[PDB]
RNA sequence: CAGGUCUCUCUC
RNA sequence: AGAGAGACCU
């Protein structure tokens, strides 16, 4: 992706979109009980922790575009992947505006406690001033679709979250692009069924992990991915995507049977317009991180990508022996023979992709189930039942979370949730964690899940 | 102060 | 069916 032009909102006739500059995050009662190196992201340019220019850091993920049109390696990949999806028989018919707004069995409803985005966000209109979960009225939507139409600008906001202090130093906070509700709807009307299939079938057929549950899915992955493991993260995946991939996406959608006017919407997220404060900018390429289908389209593009890279990098590759699951830019894959990921990253560079070890190690080492990760979690065979696999969120990640809060009101829920992550690291670590929670007044007040109840409840999922 | 997922908690 | 929250990915 690459920013094409930037114009004053005076010149574009775009309403200013301004967001909060102070974080909700406050140290918690547990801040000094546990060790941690994270602090809230830089939200304002006059942040004293800054060592570089904020806004230039913010937008530096737009590294540019390489390809615009697929090459032969990428065409082949797109058609291999689309053939794989054919067996899912996706309903390419348009989803009803009702089901699009209020969801189905395999698709959540539009998030009503979230901004309606441009222009509503500046017109003081919330999503609930238009949508209503009880009525399931759609008519108020239709009037509004007609009024403002589609292809409405994305509202750029900086993301409130804990980041490493290196990334605070360098001001590399995360950008998200608030989608206008109109676009959200129309995309869900076009692809809601595809969403449904993908959510219902995490695994190696969709090649997506969206809609998986790590407590049960982790035991299937060593079976889903047999052979030699390999894995990736990207630095700045979303913005690094050149339009080629979006073209390649189009081919996939055409092949599985989308109409041409359905497939047309892909250029509307390839080529986007964004308002950040008092300016308007154009982005060519780059996934609007924050549109409908973000995680799915990322995951779909990833599947195209891996294949394209394999067959451009290595002789004798047979993509039928490829197993990969992807969650956005997260990849866990396997092949009958060890894959040299340093060479795939080389090829990645030529497509404008910056690829890294999934651990953000400084080099690519052998990947096996004892060091593999996915969605931050590791893989730990249960000591009693070795065929059942624990998802292991690192204690130091859990430690980072617990040290802050956006609202101490939820301390109970927050701590309980972390506990449900932490017990997979086994009895010893969990009581070490619990003891530490207990060593502060507020911890002794909290309802903390018993280890053996957790384990028994995990066992009975099977 | 976005798009999604999973899970938990509280209700009716 | 409604209200919280935490975590994950962009
Ligand atoms: Mg990344
Ligand atoms: Mg990642
Ligand atoms: Zn443009």
From TrEMBL:
Protein 3A: Localizes the viral replication complex to the surface of membranous vesicles. It inhibits host cell endoplasmic reticulum-to-Golgi apparatus transport and causes the disassembly of the Golgi complex, possibly through GBF1 interaction. This would result in depletion of MHC, trail receptors and IFN receptors at the host cell surface. Capsid protein VP3: Forms an icosahedral capsid of pseudo T=3 symmetry with capsid proteins VP2 and VP3. The capsid is 300 Angstroms in diameter, composed of 60 copies of each capsid protein and enclosing the viral positive strand RNA genome. Belongs to the picornaviruses polyprotein family. Mg(2+) 2 binds at residues 233, 329-330. Mg(2+) 1 binds at residues 233-234, 329. Mg(2+) 4 binds at residues 234, 329. CTP binds at residues 159, 163, 236-238, 298. Mg(2+) 3 binds at residues 233, 330. This is Genome polyprotein. Capsid protein VP1: Interacts with capsid protein VP0, and capsid protein VP3 to form heterotrimeric protomers. Five protomers subsequently associate to form pentamers which serve as building blocks for the capsid. Interacts with capsid protein VP2, capsid protein VP3 and capsid protein VP4 following cleavage of capsid protein VP0. It is found in: Host cytoplasmic vesicle membrane; Host nucleus; Virion. Zn(2+) binds at residues 271, 273, 282. Residues 227-342 form the RdRp catalytic domain. Mg(2+) 5 binds at residue 330.
């Amino acid at each position: 992706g690459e920013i094409q032009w930037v114009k004053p909102n005076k010149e574009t006739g775009r309403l200013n979109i301004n967001g909060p500059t102070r974080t909700k995050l406050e140290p918690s009662v547990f801040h000094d009980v546990f060790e941690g190196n994270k602090e809230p992201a830089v939200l304002h340019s006059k942040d004293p922790r800054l060592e570089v220019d904020f806004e230039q850091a913010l937008f530096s993920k737009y590294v540019g575009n390489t390809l615009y049109e697929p090459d032969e390696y990428i065409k082949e990949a797109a058609l291999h992947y689309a053939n794989q999806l054919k067996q899912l028989d996706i309903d390419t018919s348009q989803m009803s505006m009702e089901e699009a707004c209020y969801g189905t069995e395999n698709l959540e409803a539009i998030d009503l406690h979230t901004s309606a985005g441009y222009p509503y966000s500046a017109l003081g209109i919330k999503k609930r001033d238009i949508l209503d979960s009880t009525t399931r009225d759609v008519s108020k939507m239709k009037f509004y679709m007609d009024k403002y139409g589609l292809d409405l600008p994305y509202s750029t906001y900086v993301k409130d979250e804990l980041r490493s202090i290196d990334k605070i130093k360098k001001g590399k906070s995360r950008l998200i692009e608030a989608s206008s509700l109109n676009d959200s709807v129309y995309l869900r009307m076009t692809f809601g069924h595809l969403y449904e299939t993908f959510h219902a079938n995490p695994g190696t057929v969709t090649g997506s992990a969206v809609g998986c549950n790590p407590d049960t899915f982790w035991s299937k992955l060593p079976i889903l991915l047999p052979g030699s493991l390999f894995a990736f993260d990207y630095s700045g995946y979303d913005a690094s995507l050149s339009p080629v991939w979006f073209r390649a996406l189009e081919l996939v959608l055409r092949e599985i049977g989308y109409s041409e006017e359905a497939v047309s919407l892909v250029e509307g997220i390839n080529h986007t317009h964004h308002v950040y404060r008092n300016k308007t900018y154009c982005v060519l390429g780059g996934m609007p991180s924050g549109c409908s289908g973000t995680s799915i389209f990322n995951s779909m593009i990833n599947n195209i990508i891996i294949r394209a890279l394999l067959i451009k990098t290595f002789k004798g590759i047979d993509l039928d022996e490829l197993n990969m699951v992807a969650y956005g830019d997260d990849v866990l894959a396997s092949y009958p023979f060890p894959i040299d990921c340093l060479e795939l990253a080389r090829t990645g560079k030529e497509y404008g992709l910056t690829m890294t070890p999934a651990d953000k190690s400084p080099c690519f080492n052998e990947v096996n189930w004892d060091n593999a990760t996915f969605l931050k979690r590791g893989f730990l065979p249960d000591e009693q039942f070795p065929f059942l696999i624990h998802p292991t969120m690192p204690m130091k990640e859990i430690h980072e979370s617990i040290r802050w809060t956006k609202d101490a009101r939820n301390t109970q829920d927050h701590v309980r949730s972390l506990c449900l992550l932490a017990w997979h690291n086994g009895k010893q670590e969990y009581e070490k964690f619990v003891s530490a929670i207990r060593s502060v007044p507020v911890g002794k007040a909290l309802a903390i899940p018993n280890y053996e109840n957790l384990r028994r409840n995990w066992l009975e999922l099977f």
